[PDB]
Amino acid sequence: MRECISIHVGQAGVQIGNACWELYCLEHGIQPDGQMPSDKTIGGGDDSFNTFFSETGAGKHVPRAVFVDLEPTVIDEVRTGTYRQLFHPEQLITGKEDAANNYARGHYTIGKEIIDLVLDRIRKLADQCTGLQGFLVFHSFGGGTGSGFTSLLMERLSVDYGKKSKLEFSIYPAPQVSTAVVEPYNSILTTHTTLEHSDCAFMVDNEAIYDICRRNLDIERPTYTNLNRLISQIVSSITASLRFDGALNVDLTEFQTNLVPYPRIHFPLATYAPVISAEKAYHEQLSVAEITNACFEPANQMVKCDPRHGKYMACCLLYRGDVVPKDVNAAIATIKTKRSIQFVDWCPTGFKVGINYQPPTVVPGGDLAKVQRAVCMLSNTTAIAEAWARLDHKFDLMYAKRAFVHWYVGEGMEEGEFSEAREDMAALEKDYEEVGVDSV
Amino acid sequence: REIVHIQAGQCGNQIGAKFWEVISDEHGIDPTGSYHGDSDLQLERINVYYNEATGNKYVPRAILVDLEPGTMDSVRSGPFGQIFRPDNFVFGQSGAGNNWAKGHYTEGAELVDSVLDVVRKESESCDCLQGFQLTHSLGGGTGSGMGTLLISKIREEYPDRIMNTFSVMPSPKVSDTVVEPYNATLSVHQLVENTDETYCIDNEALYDICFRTLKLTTPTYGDLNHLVSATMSGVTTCLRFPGQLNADLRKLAVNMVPFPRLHFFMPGFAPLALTVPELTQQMFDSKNMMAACDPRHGRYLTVAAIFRGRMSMKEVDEQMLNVQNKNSSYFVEWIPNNVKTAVCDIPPRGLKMSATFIGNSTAIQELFKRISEQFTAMFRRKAFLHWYTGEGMDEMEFTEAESNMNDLVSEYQQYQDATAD
Amino acid sequence: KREHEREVIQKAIEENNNFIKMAKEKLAQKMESNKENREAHLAAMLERLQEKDKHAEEVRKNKELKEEAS
Ligand SMILES: Nc1nc2c(ncn2[C@@H]2O[C@H](COP(=O)(O)OP(=O)(O)OP(=O)(O)O)[C@@H](O)[C@H]2O)c(=O)[nH]1
Ligand SMILES: Nc1nc2c(ncn2[C@@H]2O[C@H](COP(=O)(O)OP(=O)(O)O)[C@@H](O)[C@H]2O)c(=O)[nH]1
Ligand SMILES: [Ca+2]
Ligand SMILES: [Mg+2]
Ligand SMILES: [Mg+2]
């Protein structure tokens, strides 16, 4: 049983954390006070759910998590909210002044004042682990803390924990819910500085999630709460193999072996199904084949891009709930005979499958129907590079005029770091091009 | 968190007092400083502008400044006159005689240190100071000359805090006359170097709005100030109520100021059936601008829009996208997604819904060009210069101020002409 | 074969330590370079403001010399 420590950084990171931890508590039978009646071993144990939760002698199950933000008002709502008894106060860390949507303030000016306390607090979590597997880091690309403080933290974690695994859930910006004109700057800067310190990063395009909520759940104008509930289901699908046991369960690290062909090519595309309202789910049971088919519909992806116009280097299916391999195999054979699934020539074309038998759960008063079976597809496709292309283009438009650059230079940064970051992005786009070219 | 408010000179104190009355009402604070409101949303961010004293009393974090006692005494008798902190009145006797030099270099210089003592007191007790806002006019002597001096002095002690001004521009249509172009130009010279964000409140525009739109043949300062206060309430709502966008002064500046000198905003308001499509058309129309400039004569570098009241979020998003689509030529192409929108549930007093507009448009040069013209027609004849040399200034400083302001104009033109390709 | 086995694992240790070291030194250089840059920015800002003050004195001294002529 290898522990995983989650770190939630900045508003997006923290609010997604709220949604994820509430959902995990529901999946595991853990109450808002941390009590878990079904757990018979008191004060400790090596059950699957212990990778994510520690236990006190008082029977409280405590998330192996730190929440960090540079201003206090988002975390204050955790401190005073429904799940406030879940966390020890020292796991929730706040400053007095935010990064003002400025990577430089998050990474240097404001961030440097709290970084040591954050690492000290993470260290206390790690000291309670007998075989720490790694970290899961939740953050936005666009915010000043999400971008700059996360980069600083990832650099420091590489120093303090070596090549111990670090996975990200990264919120890629969309204009429907963006709050800063400079988000392209922050995105490129953080992506550049974090690239070498991250083993696997799952990007979540807020526009893809926004459009799924509008279209699939009929939400007129999605809020963060709508987005975050959807995002937590996806995050849960991804971490379920670490949190539950089972015969057909396959560990996330085993998928990772297939998902990462080169250190830099480590951004899987997630697609999730079924996303459906209670009103439409009623009397409409969605078979293994229907949800599997939905995985190859680009409308169901967490990042907007078109895999039909790229090449696959890996395809993984993470099923949960009422699912048996026979039906999975039939469904896959069907997809194979009818879809544009083209692999690069240096990779095998088999889909890697895992099944966790614990069915999905929903939060009370949410938008998603409770279903009997769900699936998250994780693929490594050249198509994901479109997301970088779009962001890099917005960066170029502004940078050619040095618009807003003075806000960064004023906090001590140099133009040199902008061009260095931009060139690393250009090289990344190029890397994704090369892996798709046929072997000579 | 905390903002410190400074009001200087006659105009400064008049629009300042109106500002506190209006927002005190929005926040449910009565004139004695006691809260009697209905919504918890009124108090969530009350600390931005108010100090809490024992007795659950709220005291504006406000400092009142003038080189004569007149307006200040008027304030103390006003409706909310007793709400202010008595120690925060710092008036002299000399007066400034509508002379920037007197406010900036001599008279104002004499009173400035006692003002700083109050600023420092208010600042020291702040959990985490955001920065400052100053209300003043640029046409007189105290607000203009001493106001700019105060900005300089405060920056020296708080170089890492945001400096925001609400600056009332002079106009012959309202004019206290006659050296106003000198005062204004000398002022703008200071604002260009030493503030982070300036709201250009243009008397030329307030007049044309009262006269033409409101149908007031004889507009008083009272009528002008209703416009000013409605605007000021609007552009501070994202600072005063919970929310996501431009929720503090630094985040606003980072969204609004692509180049450090280009920080002069054209504010707008609506209304002056009232649907979302109608609010939207109105807040973007030249007639609703508080600065005498036509945005169809330049391009928008950045925009903030604030909608207030109960309305469809979906409808707002659509109308805002529609405005940009249909008017794409008037938003620079090389700053993507440069228009941000906020919606606050709490409407201003006496309206079901309203919209406030904050624009950084290269068309603001029409305002500076108009001042520059009036400045040069006097300066070329060296008219009234002795009022200024008589306090120790050389012509050089006039020449420099003129130049810096002409440079500002050229810089707006440069970015207006800029292309993505 | 045992000698090769020993070299492989030592090589793995050496590269992990070099990675950590490289990361440590680059962070230190960035934070140092950043601090110096930021302080220089603030210093030039204050030095401009203290010139404004020098010019203000110069102006009042100037009035005092033309009120003596008179
Ligand atoms: N999906 C999702 N996105 C969010 C959420 N909150 C903010 N965002 C997005 O994150 C970006 C803004 O960054 P934030 O996380 O709010 O900023 P921050 O990390 O707190 O950094 P500073 O506020 O500058 O200190 C924008 O793209 C927002 O749309 C959230 O709860 N869910
Ligand atoms: N909008 C508005 N403008 C004013 C008001 N009072 C004065 N002004 C303008 O302010 C300029 C004169 O400066 P003023 O503040 O009165 O002089 P000061 O006391 O030296 O700062 C002129 O352009 C006036 O039209 C007011 O209450 N409202
Ligand atoms: Ca146990
Ligand atoms: Mg934040
Ligand atoms: Mg006057």
Side-chain angles (χ1 to χ4, degrees):
Chain A
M1 185 284 281
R2 327 191 62 195
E3 299 88 346
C4 295
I5 293 178
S6 304
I7 308 168
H8 304 272
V9 179
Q11 172 176 311
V14 163
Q15 297 194 147
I16 293 164
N18 293 340
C20 287
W21 285 101
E22 159 173 30
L23 180 59
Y24 297 160
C25 287
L26 296 170
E27 294 178 10
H28 292 296
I30 296 165
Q31 302 167 4
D33 64 2
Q35 294 293 312
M36 177 175 172
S38 72
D39 180 6
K40 306 302 174 192
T41 56
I42 311 297
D46 62 329
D47 296 302
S48 284
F49 60 82
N50 286 128
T51 59
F52 271 64
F53 293 88
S54 57
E55 303 180 33
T56 74
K60 188 189 287 195
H61 296 65
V62 179
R64 300 185 194 274
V66 172
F67 284 59
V68 201
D69 197 356
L70 300 178
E71 60 113 349
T73 63
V74 181
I75 283 169
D76 278 353
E77 283 173 20
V78 177
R79 282 178 175 133
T80 192
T82 304
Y83 284 88
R84 68 186 179 282
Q85 302 170 59
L86 209 65
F87 309 96
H88 190 273
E90 295 183 359
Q91 291 175 256
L92 310 166
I93 302 159
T94 45
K96 276 181 186 300
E97 184 180 16
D98 66 24
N101 288 324
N102 188 338
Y103 175 97
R105 293 175 58 84
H107 185 278
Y108 309 88
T109 313
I110 307 300
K112 77 189 193 306
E113 296 301 328
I114 210 180
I115 183 58
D116 287 317
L117 178 59
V118 178
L119 292 165
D120 178 78
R121 297 289 168 78
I122 291 160
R123 171 61 62 185
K124 284 187 155 73
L125 293 187
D127 287 345
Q128 305 174 35
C129 301
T130 47
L132 175 59
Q133 194 167 228
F135 303 92
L136 311 188
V137 186
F138 295 77
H139 69 105
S140 68
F141 273 173
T145 301
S147 63
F149 185 78
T150 299
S151 279
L152 171 60
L153 175 65
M154 297 282 284
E155 288 175 296
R156 294 289 291 268
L157 290 175
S158 289
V159 167
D160 285 6
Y161 295 88
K163 286 185 186 297
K164 186 137 287 187
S165 293
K166 308 203 277 308
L167 271 51
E168 305 173 74
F169 290 90
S170 294
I171 312 307
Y172 171 107
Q176 291 87 356
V177 295
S178 76
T179 47
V181 179
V182 295
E183 284 188 48
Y185 282 170
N186 295 331
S187 299
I188 277 47
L189 290 159
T190 192
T191 291
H192 165 53
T193 53
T194 299
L195 195 43
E196 274 187 345
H197 300 107
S198 176
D199 296 291
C200 191
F202 302 97
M203 280 189 294
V204 187
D205 182 352
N206 261 349
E207 199 175 348
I209 302 309
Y210 192 90
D211 282 359
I212 288 159
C213 286
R214 273 153 91 189
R215 185 207 312 114
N216 293 61
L217 299 178
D218 260 84
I219 306 177
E220 292 189 7
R221 206 298 190 183
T223 70
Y224 281 146
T225 304
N226 305 128
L227 303 189
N228 287 351
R229 286 178 171 168
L230 179 43
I231 290 166
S232 66
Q233 294 292 347
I234 294 148
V235 169
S236 167
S237 284
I238 291 161
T239 64
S241 51
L242 309 177
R243 287 179 301 105
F244 297 97
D245 221 41
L248 317 164
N249 189 42
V250 355
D251 211 73
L252 184 57
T253 63
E254 202 173 286
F255 295 111
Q256 240 183 289
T257 307
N258 283 14
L259 285 165
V260 188
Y262 308 90
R264 287 163 64 87
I265 307 313
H266 67 234
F267 300 89
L269 177 68
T271 308
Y272 179 87
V275 177
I276 181 174
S277 72
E279 291 76 13
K280 313 253 204 309
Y282 186 63
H283 286 349
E284 259 53 83
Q285 275 311 276
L286 313 91
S287 69
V288 166
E290 294 171 301
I291 65 175
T292 304
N293 284 329
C295 288
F296 293 87
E297 239 306 311
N300 302 323
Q301 299 164 181
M302 294 168 42
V303 178
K304 290 169 87 118
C305 63
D306 198 345
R308 309 176 265 106
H309 299 153
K311 295 188 187 184
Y312 288 86
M313 296 169 278
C315 189
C316 311
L317 291 160
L318 331 205
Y319 288 93
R320 68 192 305 186
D322 169 39
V323 176
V324 300
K326 168 175 81 270
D327 294 327
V328 172
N329 293 338
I332 287 177
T334 291
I335 276 80
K336 274 295 179 75
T337 68
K338 310 183 177 175
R339 287 272 198 182
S340 34
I341 305 174
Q342 184 106 46
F343 283 74
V344 296
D345 65 15
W346 49 263
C347 174
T349 65
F351 299 0
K352 186 172 171 58
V353 171
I355 299 160
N356 265 274
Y357 275 130
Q358 164 97 350
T361 310
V362 299
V363 166
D367 312 289
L368 285 176
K370 172 106 167 52
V371 300
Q372 274 195 110
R373 62 192 69 77
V375 65
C376 181
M377 181 167 89
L378 300 179
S379 56
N380 184 18
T381 164
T382 61
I384 200 144
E386 289 178 47
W388 305 129
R390 289 190 304 271
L391 217 43
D392 290 338
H393 179 62
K394 290 174 191 299
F395 180 105
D396 292 344
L397 284 177
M398 293 190 300
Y399 196 67
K401 312 290 182 288
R402 301 303 192 268
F404 307 98
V405 170
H406 75 282
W407 287 112
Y408 295 70
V409 168
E411 295 292 359
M413 289 189 58
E414 297 173 359
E415 285 190 325
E417 305 172 65
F418 279 76
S419 54
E420 163 192 318
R422 182 60 181 86
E423 285 159 14
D424 193 18
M425 295 310 298
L428 191 64
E429 286 194 43
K430 184 180 190 185
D431 291 335
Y432 269 94
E433 230 179 294
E434 294 172 342
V435 299
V437 177
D438 285 335
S439 300
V440 174
Chain B
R1 196 181 297 84
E2 299 89 354
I3 285 178
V4 171
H5 170 94
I6 304 175
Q7 45 187 75
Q10 172 159 71
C11 178
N13 280 275
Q14 251 133 241
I15 70 181
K18 279 292 154 293
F19 167 74
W20 288 103
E21 298 179 12
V22 177
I23 67 156
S24 287
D25 167 66
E26 293 186 14
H27 280 277
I29 314 298
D30 75 29
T32 79
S34 295
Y35 174 83
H36 291 280
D38 44 84
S39 169
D40 296 76
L41 301 199
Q42 293 177 300
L43 289 184
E44 206 172 299
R45 300 188 77 199
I46 197 80
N47 334 84
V48 179
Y49 280 106
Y50 296 85
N51 288 317
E52 185 166 350
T54 305
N56 305 337
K57 295 283 197 157
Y58 294 93
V59 189
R61 188 169 311 101
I63 302 172
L64 301 85
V65 180
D66 208 341
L67 285 168
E68 69 160 20
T71 319
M72 307 243 311
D73 294 332
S74 317
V75 161
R76 206 188 279 91
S77 307
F80 283 80
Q82 298 292 302
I83 206 177
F84 296 96
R85 179 175 180 248
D87 275 1
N88 284 16
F89 294 73
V90 190
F91 52 82
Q93 293 297 340
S94 45
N98 283 338
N99 190 329
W100 184 89
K102 282 180 175 161
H104 195 75
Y105 282 131
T106 49
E107 314 302 339
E110 203 156 355
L111 193 68
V112 83
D113 289 331
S114 52
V115 167
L116 292 176
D117 288 333
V118 189
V119 175
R120 192 173 310 102
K121 178 279 180 195
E122 288 289 358
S123 282
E124 272 186 26
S125 68
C126 284
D127 197 22
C128 191
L129 182 64
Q130 291 195 46
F132 309 84
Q133 58 180 65
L134 171 74
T135 51
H136 62 147
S137 63
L138 306 188
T142 304
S144 81
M146 190 179 180
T148 51
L149 176 65
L150 272 163
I151 286 157
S152 211
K153 299 310 289 292
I154 292 178
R155 207 137 170 93
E156 228 178 312
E157 253 177 276
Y158 304 91
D160 56 343
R161 300 290 102 208
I162 295 291
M163 179 67 60
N164 170 234
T165 69
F166 293 83
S167 301
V168 181
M169 310 301 163
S171 172
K173 287 175 189 175
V174 168
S175 194
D176 277 19
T177 337
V178 67
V179 292
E180 287 197 346
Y182 287 161
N183 298 330
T185 295
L186 295 170
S187 274
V188 167
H189 185 59
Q190 302 294 312
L191 297 174
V192 164
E193 308 289 337
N194 294 308
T195 68
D196 296 306
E197 33 197 15
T198 289
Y199 294 98
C200 302
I201 309 292
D202 187 10
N203 272 354
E204 176 101 9
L206 306 185
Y207 177 92
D208 289 345
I209 289 168
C210 291
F211 186 87
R212 302 179 183 178
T213 297
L214 301 183
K215 295 310 201 306
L216 299 168
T217 51
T218 305
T220 56
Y221 282 117
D223 304 317
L224 273 34
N225 295 358
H226 207 246
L227 296 181
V228 174
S229 80
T231 295
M232 286 186 63
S233 176
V235 308
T236 65
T237 82
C238 289
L239 304 181
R240 295 184 289 112
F241 295 103
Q244 290 302 317
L245 172 68
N246 292 333
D248 63 80
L249 297 169
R250 194 176 298 276
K251 277 184 175 184
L252 175 70
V254 169
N255 279 344
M256 293 298 303
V257 177
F259 306 100
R261 292 163 57 82
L262 305 198
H263 62 261
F264 301 90
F265 306 152
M266 170 183 339
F269 192 89
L272 278 180
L274 191 56
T275 61
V276 175
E278 188 45 32
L279 266 179
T280 296
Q281 203 181 29
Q282 280 199 56
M283 92 186 320
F284 272 94
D285 184 58
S286 55
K287 304 190 185 73
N288 291 53
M289 298 300 153
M290 301 301 165
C293 316
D294 190 333
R296 268 111 226 164
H297 296 176
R299 292 182 158 97
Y300 281 123
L301 299 173
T302 54
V303 168
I306 310 84
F307 289 84
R308 299 185 75 184
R310 311 196 72 240
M311 65 196 85
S312 177
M313 187 66 27
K314 178 165 76 73
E315 196 177 0
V316 165
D317 290 348
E318 293 172 346
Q319 288 315 308
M320 285 306 298
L321 284 167
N322 209 20
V323 216
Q324 297 172 77
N325 285 340
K326 290 181 180 163
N327 289 278
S328 67
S329 318
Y330 302 105
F331 299 91
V332 301
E333 43 173 1
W334 40 274
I335 304 179
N337 308 109
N338 59 344
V339 179
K340 299 305 161 178
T341 306
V343 173
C344 170
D345 286 330
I346 291 174
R349 198 182 195 173
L351 294 167
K352 277 278 192 174
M353 61 177 45
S354 81
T356 310
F357 169 89
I358 307 167
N360 196 343
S361 166
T362 69
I364 196 75
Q365 66 178 282
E366 298 182 322
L367 174 158
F368 292 119
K369 274 180 178 184
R370 181 190 89 212
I371 300 299
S372 191
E373 193 181 16
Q374 299 168 354
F375 171 98
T376 319
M378 286 181 55
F379 192 54
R380 69 177 56 266
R381 327 183 310 251
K382 297 185 181 186
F384 303 93
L385 279 190
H386 74 265
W387 294 21
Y388 298 79
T389 50
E391 301 293 326
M393 302 180 49
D394 355 77
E395 280 178 359
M396 275 293 190
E397 179 160 350
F398 280 73
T399 301
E400 283 173 13
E402 183 178 42
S403 290
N404 200 18
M405 193 169 63
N406 294 335
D407 286 2
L408 179 61
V409 165
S410 317
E411 280 146 37
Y412 278 114
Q413 189 68 37
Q414 173 192 347
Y415 290 112
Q416 176 172 314
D417 289 333
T419 177
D421 312 85
Chain C
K1 168 147 176 35
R2 315 270 81 95
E3 156 179 359
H4 175 67
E5 288 150 14
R6 252 190 288 93
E7 283 153 13
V8 171
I9 191 164
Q10 288 280 29
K11 179 151 184 296
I13 288 164
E14 175 57 42
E15 281 181 330
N16 296 350
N17 294 342
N18 199 259
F19 169 76
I20 292 175
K21 184 200 81 177
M22 234 91 276
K24 207 200 215 86
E25 300 173 330
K26 290 172 217 310
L27 199 36
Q29 110 77 17
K30 277 198 302 182
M31 303 310 274
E32 179 70 338
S33 176
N34 175 275
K35 174 191 186 67
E36 296 179 331
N37 287 342
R38 189 171 178 268
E39 284 168 357
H41 191 260
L42 290 163
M45 184 181 304
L46 295 184
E47 275 143 2
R48 279 184 296 271
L49 289 170
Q50 297 161 347
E51 268 289 6
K52 286 183 73 66
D53 290 347
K54 186 173 182 180
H55 161 90
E57 292 289 13
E58 182 183 351
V59 160
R60 291 181 285 274
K61 192 274 301 110
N62 198 251
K63 191 194 180 191
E64 197 73 343
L65 296 192
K66 83 225 309 283
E67 275 192 335
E68 282 177 1
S70 207

